Amino acid sequence: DALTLELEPVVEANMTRHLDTEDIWFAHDYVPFDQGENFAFLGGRDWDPSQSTLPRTITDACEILLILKDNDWWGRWLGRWTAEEHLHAIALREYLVVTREVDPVANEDVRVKYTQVETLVYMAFYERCGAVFCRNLAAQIEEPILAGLIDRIARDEVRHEEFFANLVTHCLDYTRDETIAAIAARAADLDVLGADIEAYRDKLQNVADAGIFGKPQLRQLISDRITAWGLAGEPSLKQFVT
Ligand SMILES: [Mn+2]
């Protein structure tokens, strides 16, 4: 269709950029397997609170990320983007279970319509949320392995945002008032990361209190993203700009 055909040269240029500037990392390289130990089923010991040494703010933030991450040139991009997201989820899970920093039972227990433009706009904001969250988190982590891991993730999220946001720029050029309306509607309705997670109210409040991510960070990044599209004085969006 017509939008897909408009976007293909932009998808190509961005895929080309993303590949030529790639600096590939592996989840397994950020996991201190030497510290791992058998659980009680295999003759070791089960988890208990004494095994966790990281601040609860840091582990709450990581559990939120993990939950979110677990859930044609364009096809080439979606496949690449998907694999990067997946990579993040593996690294986080493996770090967490090897180090025993959280109760692994909790996170392993099986018992517990958008237009195309609307979708690209949503993803640009959502990746920017990811990038701010992981940047702020990495900056508060003193444990160097984990700090390294989260910093890798943050750098990928910057790249994700750049890619989606560039597609949105081409949408603003091809089909302006549609794109603006989509930005207005997302700006009004976006919530903090993990707002949809059942029973995470306490964890969200804790990561907000630490300044990693909350309503103030969300409000500012929304203003910055609108501004970065050159839309800061656009009449229907000035109410989301600080
Ligand atoms: Mn991402």
UniProtKB/Swiss-Prot annotation:
GO cellular component: cytosol; peptidoglycan-based cell wall; plasma membrane
This protein's UniProt keywords: Acetylation, Fatty acid biosynthesis, Fatty acid metabolism, Iron, Isopeptide bond, Lipid biosynthesis, Lipid metabolism, Metal-binding, Oxidoreductase, Ubl conjugation
Enzyme Commission number(s) from the entry: 1.14.19.-
Annotated residues for binding of Fe cation 2: E85, E127, E157, H160
EC class of the enzyme, as a word: oxidoreductase
Annotated cofactor note: Binds 2 Fe(2+) ions per subunit.
The protein's required cofactors: Fe(2+)
InterPro entries tied to this protein: Fatty_acid_desaturase-2 (IPR005067), Ferritin-like_SF (IPR009078), RNR-like (IPR012348)
Residue(s) of cross-link: Isoglutamyl lysine isopeptide (Lys-Gln) (interchain with Q-Cter in protein Pup): K113
GO terms (BP aspect): fatty acid biosynthetic process
Pathway: Lipid metabolism; fatty acid metabolism
Any GO MF annotation of the entry: stearoyl-[ACP] desaturase activity
Residues binding Fe cation 1, per UniProt: E85, H88, E157
Miscellaneous field: Was identified as a high-confidence drug target.
Role played: May be a desaturase involved in mycobacterial fatty acid biosynthesis.
PANTHER family, alphabetized: ACYL- ACYL-CARRIER-PROTEIN DESATURASE-RELATED, STEAROYL-[ACYL-CARRIER-PROTEIN] 9-DESATURASE 7, CHLOROPLASTIC
UniProt subunit comment: Homodimer.
Family: Belongs to the fatty acid desaturase type 2 family.
Protein's recorded name: Putative acyl-[acyl-carrier-protein] desaturase DesA2
Biological source species: Mycobacterium tuberculosis (strain ATCC 25618 / H37Rv)
